[PDB]
Amino acid sequence: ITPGTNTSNQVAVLYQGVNCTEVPVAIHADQLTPTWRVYSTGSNVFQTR
Amino acid sequence: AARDLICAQKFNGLTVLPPLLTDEMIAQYTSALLAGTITSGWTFGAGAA
Numbered sequence: 001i002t003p004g005t006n007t008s009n010q011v012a013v014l015y016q017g018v019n020c021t022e023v024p025v026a027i028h029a030d031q032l033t034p035t036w037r038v039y040s041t042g043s044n045v046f047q048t049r
Numbered sequence: 050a051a052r053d054l055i056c057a058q059k060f061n062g063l064t065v066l067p068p069l070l071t072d073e074m075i076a077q078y079t080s081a082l083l084a085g086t087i088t089s090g091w092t093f094g095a096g097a098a
């Protein structure tokens with residue numbers, strides 16, 4: 001989720017159809033495909049349907 | 050999982066996205082339409098109720 005890059009570089013990330021408790025947090029870079037990490041607990045976490 | 054086709058669909062990359070409007074919101078829209086109709090006739094469709 002982004003506003004325009006003409007507005008900000010901040011983004012939000014929606015992990016679709018998963019519970020926030022099962023959201024993938026992987027300290028190692030070879031145990032998950034998305035290599036970037038957005039800190040689940042650190043950043044704001046909300047659970048939508 | 051064995052007794053559910055949804056789990057097989059999900060496991061093979063086929064998912065369902067939720068509608069933007071919930072059923073409660075749609076029911077609110079219909080109740081607003083009904084209230085407008087029975088209190089103001091057709092006036093609320095053309096301007097103020």
Ligand SMILES: *[C@@H]1O[C@H](CO)[C@@H](O)[C@H](O)[C@H]1NC(C)=O
Nearest residue numbers: 018019020021022047048049
């Ligand atoms: C997420 O997991 C917790 C614990 O397993 C559960 O109580 C909760 O209902 C789950 N989230 C949703 C939206 O159901």
